[PDB]
Amino acid sequence: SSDKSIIVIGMRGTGKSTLSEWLASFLGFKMLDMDKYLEEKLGTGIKSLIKAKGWEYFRQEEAIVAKECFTKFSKGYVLSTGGGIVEGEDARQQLKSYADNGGIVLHLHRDLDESSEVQEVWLRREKWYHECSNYHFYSSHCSTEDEFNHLRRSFVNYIKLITGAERPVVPVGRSAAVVLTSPDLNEVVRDLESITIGADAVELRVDLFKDTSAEFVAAQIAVIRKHADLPIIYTVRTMSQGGKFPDENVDELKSLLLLGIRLGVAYVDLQLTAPNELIEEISSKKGFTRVIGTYQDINGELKWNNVEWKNKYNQGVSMNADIVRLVGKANSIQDNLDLENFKKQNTLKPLIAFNLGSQGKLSQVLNGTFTPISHKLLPNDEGFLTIGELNQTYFDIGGFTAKKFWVIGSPIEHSRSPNLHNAGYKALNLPYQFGRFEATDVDVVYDNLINKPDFGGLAITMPLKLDIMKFATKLSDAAETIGAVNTLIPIEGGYFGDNTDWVGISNSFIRAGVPPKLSSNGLVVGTGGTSRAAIYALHQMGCAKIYLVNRTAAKLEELVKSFPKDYNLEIVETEQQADKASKVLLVVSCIPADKPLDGEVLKKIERILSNGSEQSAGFKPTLLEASYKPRVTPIMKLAEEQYKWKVIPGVEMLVNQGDRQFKLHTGFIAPYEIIHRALLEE
Ligand SMILES: [Cl-]
Ligand SMILES: [Mg+2]
């Protein structure tokens, strides 16, 4: 993780102050509004200063503030510049110098509800914004909560990439990449969530766009980031490699590849036949974007024992590509078996390798890394399999086996876990099925379900969340700390016991606009079944303090003893202490919701809810209700209507803990829209 401050530039939206605050909350940085910094230093508002002292004077003082901030606050700050800072060449050179010295100058582009004066300040400034920044991100306009979640998650991965905090992790298991081949993604915009079912990345074929200008390419990536937080593989396939981009337009190719890096794509594709100066420049400027070095035998006459494949693979190793990709053509089914022997002999780098053609299907089914898949709504001239066909054939050759998964507990009749997981299996065409099993003894569960040849995994609910832990040979850290297991899967030598209850809580917050890491504090109300997972989740999110409110203190005093001291659990003993609880922006209610709030508990809650409105952390104060019924609980009604908190019903926690459970059971990312709908449907 980089400690260097981030400078944000770009046109002023009425909420780009919020975005810089949000980013600061995520990074643990301080937010510095450079406009207010100038206004407080000079003792006057910016508007009054301009009309009284002139534009030239204002830009001089703006440049002076920039010079101080860029060196005095060069560590641990989000420096939010005034929108017009790029109007002065003094400030422009300071921005360029900051990026030249290894800093991030981030151009946050906004739609501004896409008074013609705005479009036209934009026309005058747009080139300046580009030249003064080394990174660009579209803060697009979203119309649904799911679009907002995709954009923010895309933003998080982007920030983690460009700051060097965390590179995209190359998949170790089987993985797939849906190949986006549309000339304009706006034609399938409402289908993108379904198109990406089963994919671990999206491969963007830039050369297939109807327009390859930088503006069109950037808008296409914006469309994706509103509908998928999957990592992007950015590909400009040339004509000599089966694509549409002319091989002779080398400067234009380099510019597009550099544009991908500036947009923080997870992977950029490089053709091994490209001029080596182009390859070396991109690789030396890739930063933390990963490189896939690709060669394709277009005429398809090479055999997999040909020396050309060895030379190409070794070129990929010698250029330190993160992934090598070699694509042949199958003129017989033996071409796929020859390729398997090649895969066995070249393991220094991760390798994407398969044969094209109807006779090459076997190689695409057996491929391990980022297997290209398509979708009925996309052009598919290369003839890739859909996720369902890929999973169908893999089962039919023995790659999958008919596994059985179960939810266990008592009572179990009204569990919605089977509906969630079976809908996920259906959409992925997995040969799995999910059932329920009423039980009070974990030993009858082991004899009937676990110790069976087709045992896939367990979902565990009351009253067996501790009794099941005796069968786990490997325990998750969260399972140990919370002291309960709700997911059991077979592994080598035994079984893995995990707890996804806390994952359901934090992802509920994240999906509601909360950054996945923050600096503010949290509150847990009550001692319900998910109160332990709530504490663990709040600590995972980075809450410096976790306050506790309850009717009885003895339950809370034992709660503090049962967690590590560095969790900073603090009991709210009085109403006065509730009024002075600092920076409480997250609340998990774990109290019974069948009765109304009353007593000292209500008075403590009201004071904390009242203090949530003015903290400027970049997101609304957010309350998560743990109770599944009723949908709107008294604490929810109070926080939302009286104090204007953001409010999350308990059903969201259920979907999100099942979402994580689905990944642990199957290894696949669950299709979120489908499993969310399946748990809600009555
Ligand atoms: Cl339990
Ligand atoms: Mg061949």
Numbering used by the authors: 856 to 969, 984 to 1551
How do the authors describe this structure?
In the human fungal pathogen Candida albicans, ARO1 encodes an essential multi-enzyme that catalyses consecutive steps in the shikimate pathway for biosynthesis of chorismate, a precursor to folate and the aromatic amino acids. In Fungi and Apicomplexa, the second to the sixth steps of the shikimate pathway are supported by five enzymatic domains combined in a single protein known as Aro1 or AroM. Aro1 forms a flexible dimer allowing relative autonomy of enzymatic function of the individual domains. Our activity and in cellulo data suggest that only four of Aro1’s enzymatic domains are functional and essential for viability of C. albicans, whereas the 3-dehydroquinate dehydratase (DHQase) domain is inactive because of active site substitutions.
The structure of Aro1SK-DHQase-DHSD contained four copies of this fragment in the asymmetric unit. Aro1SK domain spanned residues 857–1,032 and was connected by a short linker (residues 1,033–1,038) to Aro1DHQase (residues 1,039–1,267), which is directly followed by Aro1DHSD (residues 1,268–1,551). Notably, each Aro1DHQase mediated homodimerization within the asymmetric unit and via crystal symmetry. The regions corresponding to residues 844–855 and 970–984 were not modeled because of poor electron density. The latter region corresponds to the “lid loop” or “P-loop” that is involved in positioning of ATP and shikimate in the active site. Aro1DHQase domain within the Aro1SK-DHQase-DHSD fragment adopts the TIM barrel fold typical of type I DHQase enzymes and also shows significant similarity with the corresponding domains of the two other structurally characterised fungal AroM proteins. Finally, Aro1DHSD within the Aro1SK-DHQase-DHSD fragment shows the two subdomain architecture typical of AroE-type shikimate dehydrogenase enzymes. The crystal structure of Aro1SK-DHQase-DHSD provided the first indication of interdomain interactions in full-length Aro1.
